From a paper:
Co-crystals with compounds R05-2 and R05-3 were obtained with native protein in the P212121 space-group with four molecules in the asymmetric unit. All diketo inhibitors co-ordinate the two metal ions in the same manner as described for DPBA and refinement is consistent with the presence of two bound manganese ions as confirmed by anomalous scattering. For R05-02 electron density for the arms is not well-defined in all four copies in the asymmetric unit, although the configuration of the compound is unambiguous and consistent in each copy. The active site cavity of the endonuclease is quite voluminous, presumably because it has to accommodate at least two nucleotides either side of the cleavage site, with the manganese ions at its back. As shown in the superposition of Figure 5A, the metal chelating moiety of the three diketo and EGCG inhibitors binds in a similar orientation to the manganese ions (although compound R05-2 is slightly tilted) but the two ‘arms’ of each compound are inserted into combinations of different active site ‘pockets’, denoted pockets 1 to 4. Pocket 1 allows stacking on Phe105 and is uniquely observed with the chlorobenzene of R05-2. In fact, position 20 is an alanine in the pH1N1 strain used in this work and in most recently circulating A strains. The absence of such additional stabilising interactions probably explains why the electron density for this arm of R05-2 is generally weak.
Influenza virus replicates in the nucleus of infected cells where the heterotrimeric viral RNA-dependent RNA polymerase, with subunits PA, PB1 and PB2, is responsible for replication and transcription of the single-stranded viral RNA genome (vRNA). For influenza, cap-snatching involves the binding of host cell pre-mRNAs via their 5′ cap structure to the PB2 subunit of the polymerase followed by cleavage at nucleotides 10–13 by an endonuclease activity which resides in the PA subunit of the polymerase. The endonuclease domain is at the N-terminus of the PA subunit and has a core fold similar to other two-metal dependent nucleases of the PD…D/E…K superfamily.
Residue numbers in the entry: -1 to 64, 69 to 139, 141 to 197
Write the structure that this text describes.
């Protein structure tokens, strides 16, 4: 199996289409930078999984419920074009009064009233965390996940319940096991760069 076919069989076609456009528009070919194609899809998938099933009930408390339900706990900013991402961020700042970040985050959490930056790493978790805290310098909460099961989050506050975190980590565990059984893991593990 080529990594390219792996990606197209592993991820939802919606994630794949978004990832393909992002690479071409930035001048990269998903048929050439295949590990980067798989990394883009993975990060996107985790941002969507992170918002999945989370709403805010009548008490303003966080509920899980698995479109038709309109009180979402997170606004998804990743995946949008920059015009619309900045439009959503401004409207959130306009209406909750949080500070406008200088870099685009991945999500807004309406319960804690903060932006969130998500990282998914195959290197030691401190690394992606540092790369991101360097640029945020910083009301933007950071949460990194790894393919080994470790996480690192600002002030050791993981935002989500244990079960949602275990679902993300299970998904990453499966993605690693299936790449490994096809001899793709080693190359993917080595390709991440700072
Ligand atoms: O690094 C992350 O984990 C992450 O979520 C990054 C981002 O959202 C991008 C912006 C960014 C840049 C710096 C920081 Cl600290 C935070 C966000 C980087 C390139 N992204 C687009 C990317 C798609 C593939 C081709 C190259 C550009 C979008 C904005
Ligand atoms: Mn992002
Ligand atoms: Mn991110």
């Amino acid at each position: 199996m080529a990594m390219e076919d792996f990606v197209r069989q592993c991820f939802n076609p919606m994630i794949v289409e978004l990832a393909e456009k992002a690479m071409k528009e930035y001048g990269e070919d998903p048929k050439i930078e295949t590990n980067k194609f798989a990394a883009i899809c993975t990060h996107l998938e985790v941002c969507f999984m992170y918002s999945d099933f989370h709403f805010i009930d009548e008490r303003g408390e966080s509920i899980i419920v698995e479109n038709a339900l309109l009180k979402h706990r997170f606004e998804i900013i990743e995946g949008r074009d920059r015009i619309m991402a900045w439009t959503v961020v401004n409207s959130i700042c306009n209406t909750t009064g949080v500070e406008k970040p200088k870099f685009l985050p991945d999500l807004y959490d309406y319960k804690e009233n903060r932006f969130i930056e998500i990282g998914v790493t195959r290197r030691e978790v401190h690394i992606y965390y540092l790369e991101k805290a360097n640029k945020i310098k910083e009301k933007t909460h950071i949460h990194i996940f790894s393919f080994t099961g470790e996480e690192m989050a600002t002030k050791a506050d993981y935002t989500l319940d244990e079960e949602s975190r275990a679902r993300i980590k299970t998904r990453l565990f499966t993605i690693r096991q299936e790449m490994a059984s096809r001899s793709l893991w080693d190359s993917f593990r080595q390709s991440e760069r700072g």
